[PDB]
Amino acid sequence: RTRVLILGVNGFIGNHLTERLLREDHYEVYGLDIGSDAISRFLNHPHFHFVEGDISIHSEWIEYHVKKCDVVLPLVAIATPIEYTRNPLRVFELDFEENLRIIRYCVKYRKRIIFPSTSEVYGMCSDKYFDEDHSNLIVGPVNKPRWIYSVSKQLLDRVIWAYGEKEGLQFTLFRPFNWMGPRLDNLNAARIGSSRAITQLILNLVEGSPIKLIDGGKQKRCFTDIRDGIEALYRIIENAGNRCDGEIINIGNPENEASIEELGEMLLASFEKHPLRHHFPPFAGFRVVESVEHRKPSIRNAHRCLDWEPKIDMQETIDETLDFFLRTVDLT
C-alpha cells in the first residue's frame, strides 16, 4: 500500500483526509505533528502511525520520513491574516523556508509532493473566475505588507514548478477555497485548512461578541463543504491515469458564493434555530468596521483531472459545520 506522509496532521485536513484514506484498503498513513488530540480516534488504527515531530526543529527526522513514504502533504503553515502583518518574518520562515526544505527532500528522494498553494495567490485578479493556468496574479506595492503571504506562497509554487521542469519532481499543487465542516482548526493553529472567516463568525456567535463587517462586509467569497473538498484531495492522491502530474488545481464550490455579511446572516439564522442555542449568549449584532472583492475559482481542472464536482449545497454545509461546533463546545 501507498505510504502517505501528512505533515501537520493534527487538525482539520489531517483528520478528514486520514478518515478518507483509512476507509480504503490500499493506504498507510503517517501523520506527523507535535500533538495528536485532534486525530486521537486514529491512534490505534493498524494503518495509522503517529510521528512525533516539528518541521521547524526536526531536519533529519522529517527527511527520514520523506524517504520512507511515497506521497508527501505539507500542511504546516501560518495562514491567519493579522499574522502576515504582525509577525511577517515568522510567517516567512515557516511558510516559505521550512516548507522549501521539505520540497527539497521530495526532489532528493524522488517522492510525490501534493502541495497546498493558496487562493490568495490570485490576489486582486480581475477575472470573474480565477484560473490556475491563465489568470494573472495581482498584488499591491511592497509598502502593503499584507501581500507577503500571497507572494511567499506564489514563489514556492514557482520553485516547485521549476523542480518539476528541471529535476523530475512529481507534484500536484492544490488551492482550497474556504473549506468548512466538522473539526475546524483553531483560529491560531499553523495548519492549513479550514476557512478562518467562518470559524471567526461562529466564534462570535458562541462567545457573544459582534460579527465585524469590515467596510460593510460586502466582499464575496466561495465556501466549500469539506466532504466535497476532501473528496477532491483524495482523488488527487489517487491520481487516476496520472492526470494530476504537474497540475495546479483549485478546489472550491463556485456556486456557494456569499459576502461576509450574507454568510453572517446565514449562520445567525441556523444558530437561532439550533437546539443548543440557549447555552450561548444573545447575538451581539453586526458591527461595521473600516480600516479582494471577488474570489471565485474556476474548477475546470478539477473537472478534467478528477471528474469532480461539488455536490453539497450551501445550507447543508452551514448547518452541519455549525451543528458540529456547537455540540463540541465544552460549556464548562
Of 234, 240, 110, 261, nearest to 171 by C-alpha is: 110
List the one residue out of 247, 253, 201 whose CA is nearest residue 229: 253
Fold of 195-223+255-291+311-332: UDP-galactose 4-epimerase; domain 1 (3.90.25)
The verdict on whether residue 273 carries a ligand-binding annotation is no
CA distances from 203 to 66, 196, 231, 287 (A): 37, 10, 27, 15
Domain 1-194+224-254+292-310, CATH number (from 3.40.50.300, 2.30.30.40, 3.40.50.720, 3.40.50.970)? 3.40.50.720
Q: Is the dihedral of CA 10, 6, 149, 93 positive or negative?
A: positive
Give the residue among 256, 228, 258, 232 at the shortest CA–CA distance from 314. Answer: 256
219 is in an annotated binding site: yes
- Residue 39 DSSP symbol: S
Write down the domain spans for the chain.
1-194+224-254+292-310, 195-223+255-291+311-332
Contacts of 306 (CB under 8 A, 6+ apart): 232, 235, 236, 243, 244, 249
Query: Nearest Cα to 14, choosing from 175, 171, 183, 173?
Result: 183
| 33 has binding-site annotation | yes
Give the catalytic positions in this structure: 120, 295
CA nearest neighbour of 206 among 268, 258, 273, 287: 268
**108 assigned binding-site residue:** no
